[model samples]
Target chain A: CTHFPGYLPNMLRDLRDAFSRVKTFFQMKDQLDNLLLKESLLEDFKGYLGCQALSEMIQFYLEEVMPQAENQDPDIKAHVQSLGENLKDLRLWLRRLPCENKSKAVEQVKNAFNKLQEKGIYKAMSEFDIFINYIEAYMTMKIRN
Target chain B: CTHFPGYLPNMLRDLRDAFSRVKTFFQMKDQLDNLLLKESLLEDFKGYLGCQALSEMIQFYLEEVMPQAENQDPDIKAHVQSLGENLKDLRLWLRRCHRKNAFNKLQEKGIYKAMSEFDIFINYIEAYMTMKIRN
Candidate 1:
């Protein structure tokens, strides 16, 4: 059983399965057929859906959290905004992947998913990380008022 | 230049460069060179970094913004958590991709990088969908 927190999405399964089929098709390079090509496209759809889902999620988070994000929290906002930008790039990139090799395309999709996890340091930052000086100022005012 | 907000990471850039080489290798039935393989691994590294970053961000929002996202928000939490699991699975899969596709591997890393963005949809709902219940 994998120990990763159970909060990810279905994009992984689609990516792997599509990759397997891609590998098979490549193995039969000269013997490629209509069926294989169709299957590859199907797998690509899975990837496309997954990417769109993530992009939507980022937008959703921004909607709920932006109100709370402090203007003075430049660092946090930068990271938050970066997260949004990352989604946009991934979206554009996935749209272009399927036309290429099916198997390799599969690997590319899976790898991108993992890369985001490694770079979003802002997520690990504290409540204070999302916003700072303003929250403190608000609290002080609340107390004094 | 495109008017997008964020820049692509070096790893992703390398993947884009290597992707073309591998595609050519596949079509020509030629062997992928060492450089092709190295670039593929770099792509995987960048991918994992990106996914983990999203996960962490979502987790923070869950803990901070959605106080109601506990059992009270079981459905939302379950879905968000599911995406997280899937992303990690993708992470392990990418590691395999790095070693297995060492030589030209097969495709451009950009394609995969693009596809993986889907995880965020789950990230969005889990962090923001569920909310406080009125007494």
Candidate 2:
């Protein structure tokens, strides 16, 4: 399952299923993006690839964003818990694959998020922020490579 | 003329005209790519924006590639001279704007950081970016 050319790519489907839990929340994040002067994090991540980008996002969430990302809203709180576990498992999966000058990627995420935070979009962060960037970075690199 | 959104983005064309000096070199690199096992450096650079990405690439050529990249082939040698000036001036124009994790951007792209004849890809992308021409 850990081998890249095989089962691991399927785990992407698993990640997608989990994302389904909170797909609706992106509405707020999407509506809020009009306030920005910058491009989306998805665009920023276009250069980065699979294992490294995915791992970096998971660690950033587990260590930085996720812990404080959830608020008292019942639906969001519930979906955050579900998605957090998915990331936790995926992190274990990512470890076996192997991975880098991650600080730049982290800074890339924060710069985008910090702008969001300035507009008071913090609650709009948590899940989609990580997954959207990860998914887009993941797919973009996939498309190119 | 250096301002972005107003003057700078338009200058990409000037650099494109300059790139005509050596566009043919990419043929060798591309045909030779059958021997390789990695992606292109263009992908590595997707994270960066106009001024920073453009500046870093120009600096890379000025400092590293240009001095030694030329071979004795007359066309290549001649184009290299034209290109060296183009790159040198471009490097300064790069300064007119201003930029990174630097090599980390390279490390992020296995194809880019991948060296040894693999330099063909970088050169190709260097050409690719040069097409963008900050002017």
Q: Candidate 1 — which residues are off by over 4 angstroms?
A: A1-127, A130-145, B1-45, B48-56, B63-135
Q: What lDDT tens digits, residue by residue, belong to model 2 across residues B1-135?
A: 245325333344444455555555433333322211112223343443311332443554454444444542344466656655754654555445432243334432321111111113223323322332232
Cα deviation at B23, candidate 2, in Å, is: 1.9
What DockQ does every candidate get?
0.02, 0.02
Instruction: Kindly report which residue stretches of model 2 are placed more than 4 angstroms away from their true locations once superposed.
Output: A1-145, B1-6, B25-30, B34-55, B72-76, B98-135
lDDT of 1 at B12: 35
Q: Across residues A35-82, which tens digit of lDDT does each residue of candidate 1 receive?
A: 211112122222322433433433433342322221323443443344
State how far residue B64 of model 1 sits from its true place (Å): 5.5
lDDT of 2: 0.38
Per-residue lDDT, model 2, residue A64, is: 36
